Design a protein around this ligand. Sequence first.
Ligand SMILES: Cc1cc2nc3c(=O)[nH]c(=O)nc-3n(C[C@H](O)[C@H](O)[C@H](O)COP(=O)(O)O)c2cc1C
Length: 362
Amino acid sequence: EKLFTPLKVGAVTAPNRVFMAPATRLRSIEPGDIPTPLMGEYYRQRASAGLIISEATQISAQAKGYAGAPGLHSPEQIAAWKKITAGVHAEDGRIAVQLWHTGRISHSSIQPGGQAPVSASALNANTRTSLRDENGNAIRVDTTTPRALELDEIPGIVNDFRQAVANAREAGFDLVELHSAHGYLLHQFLSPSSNQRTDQYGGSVENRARLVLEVVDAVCNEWSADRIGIRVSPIGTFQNVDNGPNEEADALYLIEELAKRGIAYLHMSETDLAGGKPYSEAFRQKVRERFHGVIIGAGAYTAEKAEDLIGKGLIDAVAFGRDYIANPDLVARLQKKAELNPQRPESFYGGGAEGYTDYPSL
Ligand SMILES: Cc1cc2nc3c(=O)[nH]c(=O)nc-3n(C[C@H](O)[C@H](O)[C@H](O)COP(=O)(O)O)c2cc1C
């Protein structure tokens, strides 16, 4: 078995390969998009993970697309996240913050000034996001048509990611994960289906990857490359954002470019929750030979699949989403081959302690 053996992940060392995947739970305080003591308890319960990757966290107010998702831009947010990271560290854990801009997967009612969200192009995502009703309960609402970012606004986006990483360092996170997956802003630029720009940020793969690579360079300069990871979902379709007709070639281009920066990790979200075609071993080899840090796989993994691919040398760690939602001590359960708690997906999004901090440890 290798799942329970240590792994150096940039500037930190994980004691096992069983990582907690990022999971939006939509329990922050509004107004202010502030993490809570209940969220600190949730993460503290999971601190035996080789690495915790937090729920997606806004880099700015404009980045917000879901009511209840936290930010890392305000002083009050920074102060609250400092308590959460302290709690994880008190339990000898490690925690990374996943940073996002939702782009067009958003709604005007939670944007600054009530105005349209932004994206690469002015095309509706044709999906829903999650708002809150007058009693604070999560509700699904159609996304608002976005405005295309003007060329002169793109430096501000890069600066927002830079500043959020600086804030993550102060807040005590061990690493950052850039959310370049799942149809959110960075992926909106990457994908030909959502990016119809005719400037240097659209067209060719080199132009479509331009923004994400500018963000990577900015955050590496702000902190250090050994503190930066990135989540990608480059094969398949995710929240109506496909990866285009040359998805494999384009993914390998992006990975080769990320490798030049010497970042800590590459986290690949292999399928969305509705499924998709599995990665071939050949494609995993092509990824492996292009990236020289840690590769994290995710998407309906079992311990068996993780051990298989780690032992084949194709990935270094596995991130579990829903199993970690329901099992705070997943590491111990997997080590002892114990049963897992049953999942309650009706409480994944919104609400309070129920379905959040009340899944028992062994
Ligand atoms: C309730 C829920 C919230 C999620 N939120 C995020 C998120 O904030 N960021 C992200 O990159 N993926 C998110 N995901 C995807 C998970 O990280 C993970 O890739 C996915 O659950 C598939 O893995 P699993 O079969 O182990 O659950 C979420 C999934 C679920 C079920």
